[PDB]
Design a protein around this ligand. Structure first.
Ligand SMILES: Oc1ccc(/C=C/c2cc(O)cc(O)c2)cc1
Ligand SMILES: Oc1ccc(/C=C/c2cc(O)cc(O)c2)cc1
Ligand SMILES: Oc1ccc(/C=C/c2cc(O)cc(O)c2)cc1
Ligand SMILES: Oc1ccc(/C=C/c2cc(O)cc(O)c2)cc1
Ligand SMILES: Oc1ccc(/C=C/c2cc(O)cc(O)c2)cc1
Ligand SMILES: Oc1ccc(/C=C/c2cc(O)cc(O)c2)cc1
Ligand SMILES: Oc1ccc(/C=C/c2cc(O)cc(O)c2)cc1
Ligand SMILES: [Co+2]
Ligand SMILES: [Co+2]
Lengths: 497, 497
């Protein structure tokens, strides 16, 4: 077999990116300041964290085993519990004591035949009493919210219609539906998208099969009262290339950024309209809603070139690390229109941004607050000379959070400091009467001075100030998505505004 | 109540001394070099590691909750499992989410009444299929060697005759007895010593009650074929001082270093002879044996002043940090003699040393190899300017290991490097045919550059070279004692030479 290295090597596992690979508990975390005593619930986040050194050199960050962190808050105290998802990959590699799964989303490079290739490393959501650990090439893995035990692959009591389940399902705060999809839904390189939903009782509601114009990556989507919307990143899959050992994804400079719009209820697959936005990268969706004319306002991070530069075009062409910025865009779509080409979007702020969150009590409806990561190159915001040699590679950098009030246009910015970077934030309503966007924001920090992680708690009344800074004595490697599950919410999700 | 601090403060919890407080697993540790594939067994070590910040300022290192590390070796792979002993203190403080136990060995400063005040933080030994987590003011806590679950306080099937069980029992490799004692055996300030032993079947064998001339600290002891030997450190306890909030221990410059000798089998308490060595600190025993004349050769670390300088005499007199050296001493004792004063010992090497280990297959008999920690002040051995500001305080420093061959007088020295310090080592016989002192040495390193811990594996054929260096991504705080449990030893202890 290709040799099994016995320590980590390469930039993707160097410095702050070096895997720790711990599972267990650290209770009664150290706190500077004071955690508001009324906060009660759990912040769950997932990170890619290779459990064994890869036989693939420079294996991308996206291919690392999912490790789940839970931060359990009560009466101003906080405990950490941490555990790897027991994927098929995790278990078989643990039994063998060596890596067996090969290249990202390329089964032809695996050393054994896997049934499920999930790393379950991209999002961790709450649904009907379980956590669901998500990875867009796979069904979810179900887990226990209290112990982080893995129950196994989850197929929704045999109802799951698709091979694949998106990392970005949406929770309708009014209907309590979980609205879902999968792309490549019939296997590697397929153009099949399966759109499907579940009612709060767990029964499947929608199931619609549609066809994408290209086999492109649909990482995120959007949901409004009457529509679902599929923005396609111009990374394209050819299974014949994969059979020869090639990459699953390859950029295509010749295509638009497709944005499909389908009626949310009762549609057939031929009802989808593939609108054509100017060529660019479809980043995360903040939220979408229908305005008073019935037009879709789609607000999302949007870049003009390939953010995932390690998967360049057919001729190896694309940008370098740190070159491509993404911006907070508003696209207007009208399902009634037969005009496919769309105008350049308008931009809500100027910051290089990503990982937008809203108050999910207005998800799918008009929102007026967004919280997001920023990367500010302004001199002195990040001490790059100190940070970069300690940082490793392979993951995006964020050196602050911003809060946009969409009514007033005011922006507040949280800067953790010159030798700290942030992950994706979560928003927590102050209480069940709180107005939209009023409450607390939490965000994990990488402290490059200590080479430790910290968890910051902010009040939305003044985002610039830490009310509490929770000081971890270990590193939590840069991660992907996370969510708050409030103790006062019976189904784990907040009540509609 | 005295307020409960929410983060650690003070020199004893700063830098490398900052508690981590993690429990759980890190499997398949990163390895540089190659761990000999024939090594099979587990290295257990215990560290004091406060689970909650103390309400006592500058609480000594010796008062921290015991956390057990196991390093499980097979076929050149190694896994870490780590878990706190569930002492009464640990559990009640965990329930309250605050510290409740007060000063070291002073129950009058506790916030609640404890039955058992053990931190179980000093040694971790194997006996009859369990681990015993030891602390000299208490009975042992029994634990599972595989899972590190705590079973509870252990009383040897109701046979334990003493309130206290030493951290340094000796395992007779010929009789397979565990030879034990406790001082302050009837409670705080008592001069009662209970000497007791267990056969390999678990049945109590010896039980002798004796009386110490002062209530002095007896941290370690020695066992020969026909004698047991009790060296008393000139720290003395007065319970009236404790009732006023004072220290359990206070140095007494006016007394000798007492060395009691008792016949090993069949004695009464009045058979003890209290010999009087020149005033000094009784450090760890390497081993003791009877020579051809029937005289006891007692080989032990010995200093001329108070190593535990934070507990000075009644007038605050005592040395400063880093001042006192201990040396490898040989005391000759003759139980037949009626002369109580003893001569100055001879010294086996020049090094400032401690934490001596032998090949325990000759424990209680003549040994000719000792492995020990050294602290070399020679310029450049340790880069103090880099290390000291990162080190914190409260624990002893060792910047090498030494191996003394007692027949030839040859010494080899292992120096991990200018920015690394060591803990106490373990010795592992090469196999069951190996000659005395032939095999492997393991030692945990603090790497002040990375602020990580490492586990070094050395071959006794060349102590200067690391065969393997196991690279932990977390800190294990400086600890106390540890032991090897070989997989080929059914009862956990090696076969006699
Ligand atoms: O398997 C995976 C597939 C896709 C992803 C996407 C990640 C991602 C990361 C960003 O910084 C911006 C973004 O818009 C998306 C993660 C894992
Ligand atoms: O503490 C400090 C940390 C970083 C800096 C950076 C300065 C700088 C100056 C430029 O003209 C361009 C730039 O991209 C950066 C200054 C002070
Ligand atoms: O969503 C993402 C956005 C940006 C990146 C950057 C990756 C990267 C990889 C390297 O080898 C070096 C580097 O400096 C950066 C990764 C994911
Ligand atoms: O039948 C019994 C008679 C007496 C005892 C005493 C137990 C005891 C335990 C301690 O930790 C401290 C102590 O001072 C006393 C137990 C049983
Ligand atoms: O509760 C406790 C009581 C005593 C001890 C002794 C520790 C010790 C440490 C040294 O550096 C040298 C030594 O000879 C002994 C530890 C814990
Ligand atoms: O908080 C602290 C900050 C700095 C230090 C430095 C200690 C030190 C000790 C030495 O023997 C030599 C040296 O060059 C430095 C200690 C504590
Ligand atoms: O066995 C031992 C030998 C030495 C020591 C040193 C402790 C110490 C405590 C401090 O607060 C500051 C310091 O610089 C050193 C502790 C135990
Ligand atoms: Co995402
Ligand atoms: Co000891």
């Amino acid at each position: 077999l290709p040799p099994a290295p016995r320590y980590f090597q390469g930039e993707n596992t160097a410095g702050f990116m070096r895997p720790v690979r711990f599972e267990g508990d650290i209770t009664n975390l150290e706190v500077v300041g004071e955690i508001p005593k009324s906060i009660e619930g759990t912040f769950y986040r997932v990170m890619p964290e290779p459990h064994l050194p890869s036989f693939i050199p420079n294996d991308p960050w996206f291919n690392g085993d999912g490790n789940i962190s839970g931060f359990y808050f009560k009466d101003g105290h906080v405990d950490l519990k941490q555990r790897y998802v027991r994927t098929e990959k995790f278990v078989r590699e643990a039994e063998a004591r060596r890596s067996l799964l090969g290249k990202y989303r390329n089964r032809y490079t695996d050393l054994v035949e896997f049934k499920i290739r999930s790393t379950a490393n991209t999002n961790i959501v709450y649904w009907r009493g379980q956590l669901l650990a998500l990875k867009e090439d796979s069904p979810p893995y179900a887990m226990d919210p209290e112990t982080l035990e893995t129950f196994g692959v989850y197929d929704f009591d045999g109802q799951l219609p698709s091979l694949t389940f998106t990392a970005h399902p949406k929770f309708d705060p009014v209907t309590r539906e979980m609205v879902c999809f999968g792309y490549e839904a019939k296997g590697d390189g397929t153009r099949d998208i399966c759109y499907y939903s579940f009612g709060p009782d767990g029964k499947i509601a929608e199931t619609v099969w549609l066809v994408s114009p290209v086999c492109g990556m649909i990482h995120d989507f959007a949901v409004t009262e009457n529509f679902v919307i599929f923005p396609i990143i111009p990374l394209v899959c050819d299974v014949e290339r994969m059979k020869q050992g090639g990459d699953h994804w390859q950029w295509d400079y010749s295509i638009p950024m497709y944005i499909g719009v389908l009626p949310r209820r009762g549609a057939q697959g031929s009802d989808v309209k593939w609108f054509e936005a100017p060529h660019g990268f479809a980043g995360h969706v903040a939220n979408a809603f229908e305005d008073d004319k019935g037009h879709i306002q789609l607000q999302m991070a949007y870049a003009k070139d390939n953010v995932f530069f390690w998967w360049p075009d057919a001729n190896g062409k694309g940008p370098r690390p740190g070159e491509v910025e993404a911006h907070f865009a508003n696209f207007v779509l009208d399902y009634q229109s037969d005009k496919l080409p769309l105008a350049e979007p308008t931009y809500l702020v100027d910051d290089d941004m990503e990982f937008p969150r809203i108050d999910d009590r207005v998800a799918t409806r008009k929102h007026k607050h967004t919280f997001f990561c920023i990367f500010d190159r302004k001199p002195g915001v990040t001490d790059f000379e100190f940070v970069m040699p300690r940082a490793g590679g392979g993951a995006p950098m964020s050196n602050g959070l911003a809060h946009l009030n969409h009514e007033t246009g005011d922006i507040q910015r949280y800067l953790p400091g010159p030798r700290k970077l942030t992950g994706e934030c979560i928003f927590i309503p102050r209480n069940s009467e709180a107005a939209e966007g009023d409450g607390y924001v939490m965000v994990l920090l990488a402290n490059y001075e200590d080479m430790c992680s910290e968890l910051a708690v902010l009040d939305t009344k003044d985002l610039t100030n830490e009310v509490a800074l929770i000081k971890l004595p270990v590193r939590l490697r840069p991660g992907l998505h996370g969510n708050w599950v409030d103790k006062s919410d019976v189904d784990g999700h907040p009540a509609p505004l």
